[PDB]
Design a protein around this ligand. Structure first.
Ligand SMILES: Nc1ncnc2c1ncn2[C@@H]1O[C@H](COP(=O)(O)OP(=O)(O)OP(=O)(O)O)[C@@H](O)[C@H]1O
Ligand SMILES: Nc1nc2c(ncn2[C@@H]2O[C@H](COP(=O)(O)OP(=O)(O)O)[C@@H](O)[C@H]2O)c(=O)[nH]1
Ligand SMILES: [Mg+2]
Lengths: 206, 181, 68, 352
């Protein structure tokens, strides 16, 4: 690393600094004073003080990226968001008066909720002890399941049975299915929670 | 605090670790009390410098163009891209990159995000005019070099507290990450 | 030949013949203006093309064609 | 609704409507614009279930010129120019809508760039063996020309006997629609049917039967270059295409009773840099000589009033779903990221 150990990662939060000195506790006051002496790394290309910044969508874009092509990854992500928004508007205009109160048209809400509906609570760990591999259950950290939701979504949308359907249209359809607790990714979550229930005795091995 | 070996040099006597700690505890106890001028000089005898300038970023001086408009110039570098920005005290948010409007120079939305970051952080969007010249590098390197130059130039027209806030956000630090051999 | 030229000569040009034909047709349907028109055309053909030159040409052509 | 205007008749718009949106009825949409509107404005129409156009200074000036047009003088060439995605195509569409409501004959070319690239079925014209025909691209235009001007095709009547083949011919005095029909049925005679139509419309309009509007978007394609090749892998010049060669005759001001309105476009252009937008840069020497004298009208980015009204229109359609977009900080961020450019603003607001 070209940064020395002294350098600390920057805090881009714009509302943090505007917090009044009166609201500062003694501990937070000490942290603020300490940070002044410290060296800070240059903020990286990416996150910004922009009010539209969404770390989850940035991570999803980074995980769709291939070969450093971030322009194409972001183009695909924005096309997916636009397709989701247009499909929801189309479904909203064709709805009855009472059905229009339960149709979500905000694409960010749909994306976050879809990625929440695919997170597995428990997982499996391959562990060979007796000369035979044993898949023991384990509860996943929050980071691990948050990563797994995105990885499963991307892998499902890259499956080759989806033939000549361009990526944005596939991804919007998968997101809208997962929004309603349907589709192959929710099935992949359920079939993991079932293979981790059919091995609840091997947990003791861990 | 004076470190053990140079304390030995000052005393011209070899001394252990524990007695060094005892001396330093006495010095701290003296510092806590309402030490006077002579006492502060005595304590200063046993303290070298590590520099407090990490606190303070250097503020550029405000210059004046022939029309009488106040402005400030600064420079930045990212990978091989090198940028020099001129920020005018009063403006309407017009950024000119190499004599071209910024949205025409930077088609990609991300670079425009990068140019937006410094002014947006201090809530001064639409309140300055920028005339920058960048050279070398690629799209993102040029965007980052411009962003650093505008941050350094904008340091002149904000409060010292906002200068520190920009420093803590990583907006005034050259990024040293470059291609390895 | 015209292709060899590095300066624009308004006299005996496509622009000159076009504007003459247009004015003859206007007279059938029914100068400083032509001087300013040729100045604008020569500027656009020789110097750099900016929006100021384009606007100057627009005003000249509007006055020639009686557009307001 | 501060962003909307109830005066939905383009003949009565003035400077007080600048920045306000007026609605185009579905009937006018399907009649006047089978092909005119930009591809990404049609998406907005389908999503919002309405086609609302903002009234801007370019279109207002171009309408004020057309209202005071003397139909005895030769047709005047108006050229809309401006930076990329600034609103020149939609200003042209505004003017086309104004002229259609006053019973003009609309000769609208949605994009002249399509006729100089990516043609699979290129033929040699039987009428003239040194020119090529584009039956797919001419038959596609003929159907929509029939749709837009269905009324006049029976009132207008040809003035010569046209021979399609030894068996089939159109006799003098027949309605023009028949010719159109002959182009729509047998695409082999599509390009020949287009030229005849032009030959009629430029001629009879002089006689005074109707007022003709020649609206050509992406006009800079006619005097440029093509990416079309022969069988010996040689380049074909634009003047060797019959469809292009016949349209250049409409641009010359050797007729009266109409106006020629044009719009430059670097989008879809061939062998032009991205940042070229000025009339000479895009037209070329030949194109500028062909159009000179012409009136160039500049289209710019949204001014603050127009930008605020556009964002208010999007909000009134509930098209900005992000919670921070309505706020003032969000509007400042949108303004900076787009720089008030209508196209960039629309694209960024699309996924918000
Ligand atoms: N008068 C207008 N009313 C409503 N929307 C407009 C108007 N002008 C521009 N826009 C918005 O800008 C987008 C792009 O505008 P337009 O299609 O007219 O581009 P253009 O200036 O012809 O550019 P290009 O060179 O890309 O063809 C339109 O889709 C619409 O979103
Ligand atoms: N198939 C066919 N096409 C015709 C006939 N007459 C005119 N056209 C077409 O309509 C256009 C009329 O425009 P014109 O001024 O005559 O151009 P020209 O080729 O130089 O003679 C021509 O380009 C032809 O393509 C005709 O008698 N038969
Ligand atoms: Mg256009």
């Amino acid at each position: 690393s070209r940064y020395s150990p002294e350098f600390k990662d920057p805090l881009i939060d714009k509302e943090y600094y505007r917090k009044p000195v009166e609201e500062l506790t003694e501990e937070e006051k000490y942290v603020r004073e300490l940070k002044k002496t410290q060296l800070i790394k240059a903020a990286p290309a990416g996150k910004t003080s922009s009010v539209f910044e969404d770390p989850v969508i940035s991570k999803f874009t980074n995980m769709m990226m291939i070969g450093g092509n971030k322009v194409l990854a972001r183009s695909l992500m924005i096309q997916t968001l636009e397709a989701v928004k247009r499909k929801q508007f189309e479904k909203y205009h064709a709805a009855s008066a009472e059905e229009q109160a339960t149709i979500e048209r905000n694409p960010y809400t749909i994306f976050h909720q879809a990625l929440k509906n695919c997170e597995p609570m428990i997982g499996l760990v391959p562990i060979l002890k007796g000369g035979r591999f044993y898949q023991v259950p384990v509860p996943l950290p929050d980071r691990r399941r948050r990563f797994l939701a995105m990885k499963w979504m991307i892998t499902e949308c890259r499956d080759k049975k989806h033939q000549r359907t361009l990526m944005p249209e596939k991804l919007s359809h998968k997101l809208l299915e997962a929004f309603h607790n349907q589709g192959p990714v929710i099935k992949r979550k359920h079939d993991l929670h079932k293979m981790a229930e059919a091995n609840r005795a091997l947990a003791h091995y861990r | 605090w004076l470190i053990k070996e140079e304390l030995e040099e000052m005393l011209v006597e070899k001394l252990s670790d524990l007695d060094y700690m005892q001396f330093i505890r006495l010095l701290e106890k003296l510092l806590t009390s309402q030490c006077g001028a002579a006492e502060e000089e005595f304590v200063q005898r046993f303290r070298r410098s590590v520099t407090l300038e990490s606190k303070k970023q250097l503020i550029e001086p405000v210059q004046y163009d022939e029309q009488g408009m106040a402005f400030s110039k600064s420079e930045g570098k990212r990978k091989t891209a090198k940028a020099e920005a001129i920020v005018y005290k009063h403006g309407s948010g017009r950024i000119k990159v190499n004599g071209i409007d910024y949205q025409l120079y930077f088609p990609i939305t991300q670079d425009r995000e990068q140019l937006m970051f410094p002014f947006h952080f201090v809530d001064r969007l639409g309140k300055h005019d920028v005339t920058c010249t960048v050279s070398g590098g690629g799209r993102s390197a040029q965007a980052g070099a411009i962003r650093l130059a505008m941050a350094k130039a904008l340091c002149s027209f904000v409060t010292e507290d906002e200068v520190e806030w920009m420093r803590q956000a990583g907006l005034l630090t050259t990024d040293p990450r470059v291609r390895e051999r | 030949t015209e292709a060899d030229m590095e300066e624009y000569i308004w006299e005996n040009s496509s622009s000159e013949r076009n504007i003459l034909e247009t004015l003859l047709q206007m007279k059938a349907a029914e100068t400083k203006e032509i001087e300013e028109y040729k100045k604008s055309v020569v500027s656009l053909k020789n110097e750099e093309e900016n929006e100021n030159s384009i606007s100057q040409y627009k005003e000249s052509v509007k006055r020639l064609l009686n557009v307001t | 609704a501060i962003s909307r205007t109830n005066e939905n008749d383009p003949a009565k718009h003035g400077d007080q409507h600048e920045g306000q949106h007026y609605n185009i009825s579905p009937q006018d949409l399907e009649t006047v614009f089978p092909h005119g509107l930009p591809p990404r404005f049609v998406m907005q129409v389908k999503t919002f279930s309405e086609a609302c156009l903002m009234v801007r200074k370019p279109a207002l000036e171009l309408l004020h010129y057309l209202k005071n047009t003397s139909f005895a003088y030769p047709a005047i060439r108006y050229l809309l120019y401006g930076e990329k995605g600034t609103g020149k195509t939609l200003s042209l569409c505004h003017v086309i809508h104004f002229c259609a409501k006053q019973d003009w004959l609309i000769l609208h070319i949605p994009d002249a760039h399509l006729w100089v690239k990516n043609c699979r079925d290129l033929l040699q014209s039987s009428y003239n063996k040194q020119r090529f025909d584009q039956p797919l691209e001419a038959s596609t235009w003929l159907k929509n020309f029939k749709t837009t001007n269905e009324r006049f095709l029976n009132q207008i009547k040809v003035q010569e006997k046209y021979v399609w083949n030894k068996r089939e011919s159109t006799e003098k005095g027949s309605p023009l629609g028949e010719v159109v029909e002959q182009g729509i049925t047998r695409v082999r005679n599509a390009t020949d049917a287009v030229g005849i139509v032009l030959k009629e419309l430029k001629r009879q309009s002089s006689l005074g039967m109707f007022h003709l509007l020649v609206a050509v978007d992406g006009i800079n394609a006619l005097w440029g270059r093509t990416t079309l090749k022969r069988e010996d892998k040689s380049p074909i010049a634009p003047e060797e295409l019959a469809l292009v060669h016949n349209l250049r005759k409409m641009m010359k001001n050797d007729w009266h009773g109409g106006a020629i309105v044009s719009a430059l476009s670097q989008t879809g252009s061939l062998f032009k840099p991205r940042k070229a937008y000025l009339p000479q840069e895009l037209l070329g020497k030949e194109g500028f000589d062909a159009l000179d004298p012409f009136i160039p009208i500049l289209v710019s980015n949204y001014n603050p009033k127009e930008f605020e009204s556009c964002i208010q229109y999007y909000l009134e359609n509930n098209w900005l779903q992000h919670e921070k977009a309505p706020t003032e900080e969000g509007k400042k961020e949108l303004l900076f990221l787009s720089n008030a450019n209508p196209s960039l603003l629309e694209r960024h607001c699309a996924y918000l």
